[PDB]
Amino acid sequence: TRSAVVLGGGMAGMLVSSMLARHVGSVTVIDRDAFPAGPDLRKGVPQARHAHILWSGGARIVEELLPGTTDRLLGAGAHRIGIPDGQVSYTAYGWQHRFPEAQFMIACSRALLDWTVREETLREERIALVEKTEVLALLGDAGRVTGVRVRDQESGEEREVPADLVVDTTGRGSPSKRLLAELGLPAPEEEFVDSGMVYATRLFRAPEAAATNFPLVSVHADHRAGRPGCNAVLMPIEDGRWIVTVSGTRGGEPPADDEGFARFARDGVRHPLVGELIAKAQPLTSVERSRSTVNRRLHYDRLATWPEGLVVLGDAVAAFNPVYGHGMSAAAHSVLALRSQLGQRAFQPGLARAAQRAIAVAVDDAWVLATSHDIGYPGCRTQTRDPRLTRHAGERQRVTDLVGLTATRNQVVNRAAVALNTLSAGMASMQDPAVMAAVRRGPEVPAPTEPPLRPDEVARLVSGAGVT
Ligand SMILES: Cc1cc2nc3c(=O)[nH]c(=O)nc-3n(C[C@H](O)[C@H](O)[C@H](O)COP(=O)(O)OP(=O)(O)OC[C@H]3O[C@@H](n4cnc5c(N)ncnc54)[C@H](O)[C@@H]3O)c2cc1C
Ligand SMILES: [Cl-]
């Protein structure tokens, strides 16, 4: 009994659908895109052209909702990369010492991740994916949503899809503001922090011996410097490839051409390591760019009126500058927040509002982490009432940098920093007396003076051909 309609069948839509089918009799997923039968790019998820990191915090939730998915990804060529043992990272504060594993991430093409999650989700016969379908309107009124009116793209026929619960997971281009406007509801407060970040990506075939057991490599901006922030990330993915994504804020955006890409990876960022490694590899694709990098949040949970049976989650409610890599994990946390309110409240009145408030809490750490680091770049454009961003940003950055600095050279501080940065723990965890204690104890290793690559890692950058 009871039925749910999910708008958007991307990451949040698939995750929330898998959860919902354990609580309602049927789930219908409505998407305007066409869906490939295999792990291919598609127009509805254009960000899949760029490096995607699935931090442990999100990965564990994906596993809970769709168990066996992590192993299926690894079996398809995804990499499990330990953090910080599997990363060579020139942070704002210097090189990260590669301490033993504290957290992890899963590294693969977003196309493969999306295909795997969708295939696992649709194993549940009571979830149906309705492709090539437009979302026209929410049915019902401002007091209660009762479904959606859709248009079939092939036939042009419009029809009404009844639902006890509608979940908007249509992503960064969600039309929910319009949909809610047509209901008569007031417009939500919108908050944004826009650093002008632009991403540029190329795929490379790695040297054959480095197709496995190769680290994540990153060169980060120094957000404390009053200069445009530029970054470079090299990430292993399936089938012996490296995805390389460079980025820059206003005044340091990467160029669009193949040659400028390589020079940006060498000279536009603070250390040339990513430039040096891609020179060992074979380029497979030309530069793809994205500017879908604004931190944008819609405070739907604070609206004066909220209709029963409507919930918005994923990028549709809060989307981030992706250099921090939180979007998919934040959506996963938001799904568990809805599940928690469903378990407590079932379908009583109050459910949708309670879930919307719970979702706002679930994305808040990801929101604070991304905006607090973006707000310092030259030229940043903002619209906010958040005192964390307007006033208390000065000391929040003073304590962030003490922890960030000490995390590069102290195993206990690093463990706590990466627990938070992978969304495996909340921000209160940093106020644990033991963590503040380790911070005060400071570095236990020297600061590396060169990239902390292993000899065996660099040895696999050449074939050894040409030698008798
Ligand atoms: C360049 C870039 C890099 C990123 N890197 C990372 C990273 O490293 N780690 C990470 O965790 N996140 C990353 N992200 C964020 C991540 O892509 C998103 O957070 C994630 O896709 C959110 O899922 P979603 O389901 O809300 O949206 P999406 O996955 O985009 O899915 C939206 C779905 O809704 C459909 N749709 C859209 N509009 C409509 C409509 N009007 N009607 C019907 N259907 C509609 C689309 O076709 C699609 O199927 C990155 C994003 C970008 C842009
Ligand atoms: Cl994009």
From Swiss-Prot:
It comes from the Bacteria. The keyword Oxidoreductase applies. Pfam families: FAD_binding_3 (PF01494). GO terms for biological process: antibiotic biosynthetic process. SUPFAM superfamilies: FAD/NAD(P)-binding domain. May catalyze the stereoselective double epoxidation reaction leading to bisepoxyprelasalocid A, a bisepoxide intermediate in the biosynthesis of the polyether antibiotic lasalocid A. This is Putative epoxidase LasC. It comes from Streptomyces lasalocidi (Streptomyces lasaliensis).
